[PDB]
Amino acid sequence: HVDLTNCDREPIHIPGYIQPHGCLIACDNAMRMVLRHSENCGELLGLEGDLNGRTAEDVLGKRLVHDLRNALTVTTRPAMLPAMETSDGRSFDISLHRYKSTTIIEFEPSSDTQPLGTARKMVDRIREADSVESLISRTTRLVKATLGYDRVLIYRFEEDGAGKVVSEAKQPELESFLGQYFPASDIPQQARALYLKNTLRIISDASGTPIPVLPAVDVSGEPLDLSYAHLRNFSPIHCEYLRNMGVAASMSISVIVDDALWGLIVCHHCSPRVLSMPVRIAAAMFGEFFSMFLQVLKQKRRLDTINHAHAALDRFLRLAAHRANLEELLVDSFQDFARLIPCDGVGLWVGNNWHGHGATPPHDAIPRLARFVASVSEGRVWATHALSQAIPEAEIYADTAAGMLAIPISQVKSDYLLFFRKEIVQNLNWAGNPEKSYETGPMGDRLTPRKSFAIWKESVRLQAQPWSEADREIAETARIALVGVAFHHSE
Amino acid sequence: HVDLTNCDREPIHIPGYIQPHGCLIACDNAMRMVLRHSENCGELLGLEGDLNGRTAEDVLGKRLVHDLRNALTVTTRPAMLPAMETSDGRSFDISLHRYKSTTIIEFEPSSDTQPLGTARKMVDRIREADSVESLISRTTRLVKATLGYDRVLIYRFEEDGAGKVVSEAKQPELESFLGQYFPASDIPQQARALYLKNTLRIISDASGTPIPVLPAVDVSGEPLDLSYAHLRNFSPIHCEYLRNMGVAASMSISVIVDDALWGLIVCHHCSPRVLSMPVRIAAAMFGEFFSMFLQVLKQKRRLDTINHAHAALDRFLRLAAHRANLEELLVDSFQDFARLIPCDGVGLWVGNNWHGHGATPPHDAIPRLARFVASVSEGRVWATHALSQAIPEAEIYADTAAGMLAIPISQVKSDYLLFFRKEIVQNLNWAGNPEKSYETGPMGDRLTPRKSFAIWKESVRLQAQPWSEADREIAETARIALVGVAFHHSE
Ligand SMILES: *C/C=C1/C(=C/C2=NC(=C\c3[nH]c(/C=C4/NC(=O)C(C=C)=C4C)c(C)c3CCC(=O)O)/C(CCC(=O)O)=C2C)NC(=O)[C@H]1C
Ligand SMILES: *C/C=C1/C(=C/C2=NC(=C\c3[nH]c(/C=C4/NC(=O)C(C=C)=C4C)c(C)c3CCC(=O)O)/C(CCC(=O)O)=C2C)NC(=O)[C@H]1C
């Protein structure tokens, strides 16, 4: 039994059911015996009675079982064998994998597509992208145009597991989710684990009748682990979510960057839709290449950002050599440091005087902030995205400054360069329809984009966009530059 | 009791003794009572009998104890108070710290030096260094010339904890240790922990008589933790080591880069030598600035290396667009990839054919290597610095190729770009005297640079310089570039 109270701990990897667009035979480690089969094995393969306790060759044939064994010898990465013939001539696309010393064989009614042909075209059209923004924009349009889904989204995962819709291609009539966030809880840990293990996740029909796997549990009290099975059935919580959205079918492509789940390319259809194995092989290869190219572009962006910071700081050090009074130069220049680190406001606290630029806390609030920084900084870069958690009084000015990064600019005195960010809801660029409502099921309106967004908004109240690893790395380089030149000018 | 069998686990933080160039009073958390004192407190401070069980004001005076309390209010970072007067007029330099709710007060006969003055001069002469090599070279000469020690060394710690002498300034008559390594065991874990906690480590006189702390253990069976005490006595294992080398005095400055112990600036003197507190304050500030500047230069070098790799790969991709046959271009070009990653040889394994450049394994050995790579690679970058640990047969050609980094250049076929490194002893640039022998003590010749070096050499037999994080990051960018263009050219 699963509901909104325990769906975070739902064992979605052992659901005991498969999707009706194919049938599944479980065999022992060596493909000698048939241990489990799907109820619909009879209909598709055209066999009669129980398949459990029979031998692999008896059910499939000496010819086919020979090919399956040889594919298995040349890891849990499933082998894809299109257009395989049974004993009685019938044609099937077959997914073959071994996991927990159990051989799983998945059967699909068989296509004349070239997997590498489709993929090469798609991969050529993204390979020449020169920015993350250009890669992400074109990929949704390209995937929508090639695979013909009603909506293609890209989610990027935030540090706190939350998802942001960073790109969208859709039918004109459908409502936009572009710039909308969902909370971490909308994709449980076990789901993220499976997204990390399988490139593709197919849902052919949300309204389809799930086919049970017999037996559900074996003699030793073990369920069949469907972690790597493409026919694995979906959570009824997600089923209701898609039904509430008017979504009948989905295909997710996992984006792996630096061996972490960066996000998903997700294709939604308003009517039932399953792609054939050859199209799924193409889409998987496209996914791998999309992931690799994004990785290199992310790396390039980082290098460019850090180089820009070094250039800007060298420019400043050149000026600092010529000016006699360093404090005068900082008072004149501090706003220019806003270029180094993305921020909504910057400030200088020097000789117990304050100078502000952009969205900063109010004048009266600063001496408090400066003392707090002095106490916790310990002559190192200090940063928080949640200022009110550190200073409850800061709650009052969170709309203007919810996050703060502090850079010490003197080894001796308690002088600081302060960077500020508004609370994240202030910087929202959401292209969705707020009047658009959603039909609900038994589980309630929790399973609607509208409530998902509302819950995320509540979870980031009085919080700013967190300071990235790059932001802190640049802050540290700036600290060393300013502390160094301050020492050269000291007496 | 400590010897060569248990000196790796020697509790050097609780030795029960101090060095004779100062005296130490331990007080309670609030500096109300005197719990422990050094035997030589009587001589230096000019007091009589036992100081333990007396009150702080009774022993030092209401005036001095007031100043010590107020310094303590404005963390375990010791406060440095030069030229402090006792009740009876006598002048002392005082180190004051609180650790494990115990107040430790260290007394030195008092100097008229300006700490910031000395430091500013030294720090100005290193601030303008534009390479790690230029910073490291000039620092040994500069420190030798300023602080007047017979020898100044910089050790850089290898991944395996081993130390390399990367810079040296010495008296002409002394033997050079430049390019020499010492094994990780020559500096135990507890010693590295204290080097990380204290910027400076002083040894005034290796032949000096250690002054005991009374009581050594208190009523509750607790020793005095001297972790942050500058007067803390040194291990008799290290004492014998310095004696064997002809070293009477030492001062180490800790190099902290990215919150890790990068290495030590170490000053050796052939006669006893203690610097006054003001000179030690200057040397500590110089240490902090040396560490910060090295951090930024390390960061710059990394950026330049990765940028150079991106430029080189863009150049290659431009060529790959114009050539019809990609395999011909790789056969013509592969040696040029030697510029991306430091290596002694590079090779191409394409269509079951081998092409070698520089120090590679012999022709006959390659098919074996290629199969092994194919089995473990899993279409990812594979690297080892110890090839014989992976392939025992590789032992035979270790002098030529002890380390290997493998880059897959095809998503489909098992084609590889292979980078090789000779075993590390082949690339030694040691400037030392091999005929130079050393006097030994009871503990044996283990405590000699000669045996230290010999032990390190044995520990890295059949091993190459390990592949850095930067080497792997570039290998991964190269993989994506080559796999990408190979896909564009596939059929
Ligand atoms: C407590 C458990 C919940 C839950 C579980 C699951 N979610 C799964 C998939 C899923 N969920 C979302 C969330 C969305 N939020 C939106 O606002 C929105 C649309 C605008 C969506 C789609 C996403 C994005 C996904 C990924 C797939 C997709 O995008 O279609 C999931 C796994 C499904 C599977 O087996 O493939 C589980 C389990 N979702 C909840 O909301 C809660 C309550
Ligand atoms: C089993 C314990 C051993 C041990 C302990 C300690 N070593 C400490 C300091 C130390 N040791 C070395 C090693 C050197 N190897 C050389 O070849 C060489 C000279 C060319 C040296 C100096 C170094 C470099 C150091 C750092 C200080 C310095 O360079 O002078 C040590 C701490 C000392 C302290 O309390 O300050 C301990 C403890 N050393 C061994 O060799 C072994 C057996």
PDB file of N, CA and C and ligand atoms in Angstrom, chain B residues 3-4 6-8 10 12 153 155 165 177 180-183 185-188 191 195 201-203 232-235 237-238 241-242 245 247 250 252 264 266-268 446-450 452-453, ligand 2:
ATOM      1  N   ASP B   3      61.107   3.783  19.942  1.00  0.00           N
ATOM      2  CA  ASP B   3      62.199   3.329  19.037  1.00  0.00           C
ATOM      3  C   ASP B   3      61.625   3.207  17.616  1.00  0.00           C
ATOM      4  N   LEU B   4      62.401   2.662  16.672  1.00  0.00           N
ATOM      5  CA  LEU B   4      62.032   2.577  15.230  1.00  0.00           C
ATOM      6  C   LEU B   4      60.765   1.734  15.031  1.00  0.00           C
ATOM      7  N   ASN B   6      57.873   1.758  17.082  1.00  0.00           N
ATOM      8  CA  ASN B   6      56.623   2.394  17.591  1.00  0.00           C
ATOM      9  C   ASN B   6      56.668   3.929  17.498  1.00  0.00           C
ATOM     10  N   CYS B   7      57.637   4.507  16.780  1.00  0.00           N
ATOM     11  CA  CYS B   7      57.796   5.985  16.635  1.00  0.00           C
ATOM     12  C   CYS B   7      56.729   6.551  15.683  1.00  0.00           C
ATOM     13  N   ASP B   8      56.117   5.694  14.857  1.00  0.00           N
ATOM     14  CA  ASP B   8      54.975   6.040  13.963  1.00  0.00           C
ATOM     15  C   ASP B   8      53.733   6.374  14.803  1.00  0.00           C
ATOM     16  N   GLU B  10      54.113   7.469  18.212  1.00  0.00           N
ATOM     17  CA  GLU B  10      54.663   8.262  19.349  1.00  0.00           C
ATOM     18  C   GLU B  10      53.712   9.417  19.669  1.00  0.00           C
ATOM     19  N   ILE B  12      53.638  12.583  20.438  1.00  0.00           N
ATOM     20  CA  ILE B  12      54.585  13.744  20.441  1.00  0.00           C
ATOM     21  C   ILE B  12      53.895  15.006  20.978  1.00  0.00           C
ATOM     22  N   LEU B 153      65.262  24.710   3.130  1.00  0.00           N
ATOM     23  CA  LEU B 153      64.669  23.742   2.170  1.00  0.00           C
ATOM     24  C   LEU B 153      63.172  24.029   2.030  1.00  0.00           C
ATOM     25  N   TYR B 155      60.060  21.395   1.150  1.00  0.00           N
ATOM     26  CA  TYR B 155      59.491  20.058   0.848  1.00  0.00           C
ATOM     27  C   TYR B 155      58.085  20.253   0.282  1.00  0.00           C
ATOM     28  N   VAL B 165      62.285  17.444  -2.022  1.00  0.00           N
ATOM     29  CA  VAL B 165      63.042  18.718  -1.846  1.00  0.00           C
ATOM     30  C   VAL B 165      63.004  19.462  -3.187  1.00  0.00           C
ATOM     31  N   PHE B 177      70.506  18.496  -0.875  1.00  0.00           N
ATOM     32  CA  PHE B 177      69.381  17.523  -0.815  1.00  0.00           C
ATOM     33  C   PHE B 177      68.381  17.790  -1.948  1.00  0.00           C
ATOM     34  N   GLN B 180      65.965  15.245  -3.953  1.00  0.00           N
ATOM     35  CA  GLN B 180      65.910  14.047  -3.076  1.00  0.00           C
ATOM     36  C   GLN B 180      64.496  13.917  -2.507  1.00  0.00           C
ATOM     37  N   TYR B 181      63.987  12.687  -2.394  1.00  0.00           N
ATOM     38  CA  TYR B 181      62.686  12.374  -1.747  1.00  0.00           C
ATOM     39  C   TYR B 181      62.933  11.702  -0.393  1.00  0.00           C
ATOM     40  N   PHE B 182      61.983  11.851   0.537  1.00  0.00           N
ATOM     41  CA  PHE B 182      61.901  11.068   1.800  1.00  0.00           C
ATOM     42  C   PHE B 182      60.542  10.371   1.872  1.00  0.00           C
ATOM     43  N   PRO B 183      60.467   9.158   2.464  1.00  0.00           N
ATOM     44  CA  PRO B 183      59.206   8.422   2.554  1.00  0.00           C
ATOM     45  C   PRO B 183      58.246   9.059   3.569  1.00  0.00           C
ATOM     46  N   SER B 185      56.754   7.900   6.088  1.00  0.00           N
ATOM     47  CA  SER B 185      57.030   7.429   7.475  1.00  0.00           C
ATOM     48  C   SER B 185      58.036   8.339   8.196  1.00  0.00           C
ATOM     49  N   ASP B 186      58.861   9.094   7.462  1.00  0.00           N
ATOM     50  CA  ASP B 186      59.854  10.041   8.047  1.00  0.00           C
ATOM     51  C   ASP B 186      59.143  11.212   8.740  1.00  0.00           C
ATOM     52  N   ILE B 187      57.855  11.437   8.463  1.00  0.00           N
ATOM     53  CA  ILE B 187      57.005  12.417   9.204  1.00  0.00           C
ATOM     54  C   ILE B 187      55.693  11.726   9.564  1.00  0.00           C
ATOM     55  N   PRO B 188      55.576  11.166  10.793  1.00  0.00           N
ATOM     56  CA  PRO B 188      54.357  10.482  11.231  1.00  0.00           C
ATOM     57  C   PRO B 188      53.090  11.351  11.164  1.00  0.00           C
ATOM     58  N   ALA B 191      52.608  14.149  13.705  1.00  0.00           N
ATOM     59  CA  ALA B 191      53.520  15.269  13.360  1.00  0.00           C
ATOM     60  C   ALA B 191      52.885  16.147  12.272  1.00  0.00           C
ATOM     61  N   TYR B 195      51.834  20.113  12.387  1.00  0.00           N
ATOM     62  CA  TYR B 195      52.314  21.017  11.305  1.00  0.00           C
ATOM     63  C   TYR B 195      51.114  21.770  10.713  1.00  0.00           C
ATOM     64  N   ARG B 201      57.196  25.797  13.826  1.00  0.00           N
ATOM     65  CA  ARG B 201      57.738  24.755  14.742  1.00  0.00           C
ATOM     66  C   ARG B 201      59.219  25.081  14.972  1.00  0.00           C
ATOM     67  N   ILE B 202      59.596  25.416  16.213  1.00  0.00           N
ATOM     68  CA  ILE B 202      60.985  25.810  16.607  1.00  0.00           C
ATOM     69  C   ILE B 202      61.663  24.631  17.308  1.00  0.00           C
ATOM     70  N   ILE B 203      62.924  24.369  16.961  1.00  0.00           N
ATOM     71  CA  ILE B 203      63.873  23.542  17.765  1.00  0.00           C
ATOM     72  C   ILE B 203      65.137  24.384  17.981  1.00  0.00           C
ATOM     73  N   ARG B 232      57.051  23.175  23.373  1.00  0.00           N
ATOM     74  CA  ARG B 232      56.885  21.692  23.351  1.00  0.00           C
ATOM     75  C   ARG B 232      58.191  21.030  22.897  1.00  0.00           C
ATOM     76  N   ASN B 233      58.648  20.016  23.634  1.00  0.00           N
ATOM     77  CA  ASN B 233      59.907  19.281  23.340  1.00  0.00           C
ATOM     78  C   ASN B 233      59.689  18.380  22.119  1.00  0.00           C
ATOM     79  N   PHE B 234      60.781  17.972  21.470  1.00  0.00           N
ATOM     80  CA  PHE B 234      60.804  17.217  20.188  1.00  0.00           C
ATOM     81  C   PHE B 234      61.102  15.738  20.467  1.00  0.00           C
ATOM     82  N   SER B 235      60.638  14.858  19.578  1.00  0.00           N
ATOM     83  CA  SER B 235      60.851  13.386  19.649  1.00  0.00           C
ATOM     84  C   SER B 235      62.348  13.077  19.678  1.00  0.00           C
ATOM     85  N   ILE B 237      63.697  10.516  18.442  1.00  0.00           N
ATOM     86  CA  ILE B 237      63.937   9.907  17.099  1.00  0.00           C
ATOM     87  C   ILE B 237      64.421  11.012  16.152  1.00  0.00           C
ATOM     88  N   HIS B 238      63.721  12.149  16.131  1.00  0.00           N
ATOM     89  CA  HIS B 238      64.058  13.318  15.276  1.00  0.00           C
ATOM     90  C   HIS B 238      65.348  13.969  15.782  1.00  0.00           C
ATOM     91  N   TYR B 241      68.129  12.105  14.432  1.00  0.00           N
ATOM     92  CA  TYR B 241      68.155  12.379  12.968  1.00  0.00           C
ATOM     93  C   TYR B 241      68.948  13.667  12.701  1.00  0.00           C
ATOM     94  N   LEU B 242      68.599  14.755  13.396  1.00  0.00           N
ATOM     95  CA  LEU B 242      69.252  16.086  13.245  1.00  0.00           C
ATOM     96  C   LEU B 242      70.720  15.987  13.672  1.00  0.00           C
ATOM     97  N   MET B 245      72.828  14.457  11.096  1.00  0.00           N
ATOM     98  CA  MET B 245      72.959  15.368   9.923  1.00  0.00           C
ATOM     99  C   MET B 245      73.913  16.527  10.236  1.00  0.00           C
ATOM    100  N   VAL B 247      72.906  18.946  12.425  1.00  0.00           N
ATOM    101  CA  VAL B 247      71.914  20.046  12.604  1.00  0.00           C
ATOM    102  C   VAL B 247      71.646  20.212  14.104  1.00  0.00           C
ATOM    103  N   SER B 250      66.432  24.020  14.168  1.00  0.00           N
ATOM    104  CA  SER B 250      65.499  24.029  13.011  1.00  0.00           C
ATOM    105  C   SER B 250      64.338  24.991  13.271  1.00  0.00           C
ATOM    106  N   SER B 252      60.540  25.199  11.089  1.00  0.00           N
ATOM    107  CA  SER B 252      59.642  24.839   9.961  1.00  0.00           C
ATOM    108  C   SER B 252      58.491  25.849   9.896  1.00  0.00           C
ATOM    109  N   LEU B 264      56.421  22.121   3.608  1.00  0.00           N
ATOM    110  CA  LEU B 264      57.109  22.891   4.674  1.00  0.00           C
ATOM    111  C   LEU B 264      58.216  23.735   4.045  1.00  0.00           C
ATOM    112  N   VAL B 266      61.563  24.743   5.585  1.00  0.00           N
ATOM    113  CA  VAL B 266      62.352  24.259   6.754  1.00  0.00           C
ATOM    114  C   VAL B 266      63.722  24.940   6.744  1.00  0.00           C
ATOM    115  N   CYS B 267      64.069  25.575   7.864  1.00  0.00           N
ATOM    116  CA  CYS B 267      65.381  26.230   8.105  1.00  0.00           C
ATOM    117  C   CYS B 267      66.208  25.369   9.067  1.00  0.00           C
ATOM    118  N   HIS B 268      67.358  24.865   8.612  1.00  0.00           N
ATOM    119  CA  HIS B 268      68.341  24.107   9.434  1.00  0.00           C
ATOM    120  C   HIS B 268      69.547  25.001   9.737  1.00  0.00           C
ATOM    121  N   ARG B 446      69.091   4.175   9.897  1.00  0.00           N
ATOM    122  CA  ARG B 446      67.708   4.506   9.452  1.00  0.00           C
ATOM    123  C   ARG B 446      67.496   6.024   9.516  1.00  0.00           C
ATOM    124  N   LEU B 447      68.107   6.690  10.501  1.00  0.00           N
ATOM    125  CA  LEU B 447      67.927   8.143  10.761  1.00  0.00           C
ATOM    126  C   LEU B 447      69.008   8.937  10.020  1.00  0.00           C
ATOM    127  N   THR B 448      69.186   8.661   8.724  1.00  0.00           N
ATOM    128  CA  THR B 448      70.127   9.386   7.825  1.00  0.00           C
ATOM    129  C   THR B 448      69.429   9.687   6.501  1.00  0.00           C
ATOM    130  N   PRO B 449      69.635  10.887   5.909  1.00  0.00           N
ATOM    131  CA  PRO B 449      69.112  11.190   4.574  1.00  0.00           C
ATOM    132  C   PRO B 449      69.387  10.089   3.539  1.00  0.00           C
ATOM    133  N   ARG B 450      70.588   9.506   3.599  1.00  0.00           N
ATOM    134  CA  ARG B 450      71.066   8.415   2.696  1.00  0.00           C
ATOM    135  C   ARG B 450      70.104   7.218   2.731  1.00  0.00           C
ATOM    136  N   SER B 452      66.968   7.203   4.260  1.00  0.00           N
ATOM    137  CA  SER B 452      65.632   7.787   3.953  1.00  0.00           C
ATOM    138  C   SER B 452      65.379   7.704   2.442  1.00  0.00           C
ATOM    139  N   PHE B 453      66.335   8.171   1.638  1.00  0.00           N
ATOM    140  CA  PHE B 453      66.252   8.217   0.154  1.00  0.00           C
ATOM    141  C   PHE B 453      66.164   6.789  -0.399  1.00  0.00           C
TER     142      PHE B 453
HETATM  143  C1  LIG C   2      59.250   6.685  13.009  1.00  0.00           C
HETATM  144  C2  LIG C   2      59.446   8.002  13.186  1.00  0.00           C
HETATM  145  C3  LIG C   2      60.365   8.786  12.453  1.00  0.00           C
HETATM  146  C4  LIG C   2      60.442  10.174  12.392  1.00  0.00           C
HETATM  147  C5  LIG C   2      59.632  11.054  13.100  1.00  0.00           C
HETATM  148  C6  LIG C   2      59.632  12.442  13.050  1.00  0.00           C
HETATM  149  N1  LIG C   2      60.156  13.160  12.010  1.00  0.00           N
HETATM  150  C7  LIG C   2      59.933  14.477  12.296  1.00  0.00           C
HETATM  151  C8  LIG C   2      60.409  15.531  11.524  1.00  0.00           C
HETATM  152  C9  LIG C   2      61.030  15.463  10.284  1.00  0.00           C
HETATM  153  N2  LIG C   2      61.549  14.316   9.708  1.00  0.00           N
HETATM  154  C10 LIG C   2      62.052  14.604   8.459  1.00  0.00           C
HETATM  155  C11 LIG C   2      62.759  13.859   7.517  1.00  0.00           C
HETATM  156  C12 LIG C   2      63.936  14.069   6.802  1.00  0.00           C
HETATM  157  N3  LIG C   2      64.339  13.113   5.885  1.00  0.00           N
HETATM  158  C13 LIG C   2      65.475  13.538   5.244  1.00  0.00           C
HETATM  159  O1  LIG C   2      66.053  12.901   4.371  1.00  0.00           O
HETATM  160  C14 LIG C   2      65.810  14.780   5.769  1.00  0.00           C
HETATM  161  C15 LIG C   2      66.872  15.608   5.344  1.00  0.00           C
HETATM  162  C16 LIG C   2      67.428  15.653   4.137  1.00  0.00           C
HETATM  163  C17 LIG C   2      64.872  15.104   6.747  1.00  0.00           C
HETATM  164  C18 LIG C   2      64.941  16.370   7.556  1.00  0.00           C
HETATM  165  C19 LIG C   2      61.687  15.923   8.197  1.00  0.00           C
HETATM  166  C20 LIG C   2      61.943  16.662   6.920  1.00  0.00           C
HETATM  167  C21 LIG C   2      61.085  16.459   9.314  1.00  0.00           C
HETATM  168  C22 LIG C   2      60.561  17.863   9.439  1.00  0.00           C
HETATM  169  C23 LIG C   2      61.438  18.825  10.223  1.00  0.00           C
HETATM  170  C24 LIG C   2      62.778  19.120   9.571  1.00  0.00           C
HETATM  171  O2  LIG C   2      62.861  19.079   8.328  1.00  0.00           O
HETATM  172  O3  LIG C   2      63.737  19.388  10.315  1.00  0.00           O
HETATM  173  C25 LIG C   2      59.215  14.598  13.478  1.00  0.00           C
HETATM  174  C26 LIG C   2      58.747  15.881  14.100  1.00  0.00           C
HETATM  175  C27 LIG C   2      59.829  16.775  14.695  1.00  0.00           C
HETATM  176  C28 LIG C   2      59.267  17.890  15.557  1.00  0.00           C
HETATM  177  O4  LIG C   2      58.767  17.576  16.658  1.00  0.00           O
HETATM  178  O5  LIG C   2      59.317  19.066  15.124  1.00  0.00           O
HETATM  179  C29 LIG C   2      59.002  13.304  13.939  1.00  0.00           C
HETATM  180  C30 LIG C   2      58.258  12.931  15.189  1.00  0.00           C
HETATM  181  N4  LIG C   2      61.439  10.540  11.489  1.00  0.00           N
HETATM  182  C31 LIG C   2      61.988   9.389  10.945  1.00  0.00           C
HETATM  183  O6  LIG C   2      62.901   9.339  10.159  1.00  0.00           O
HETATM  184  C32 LIG C   2      61.293   8.342  11.526  1.00  0.00           C
HETATM  185  C33 LIG C   2      61.977   7.018  11.711  1.00  0.00           C
END
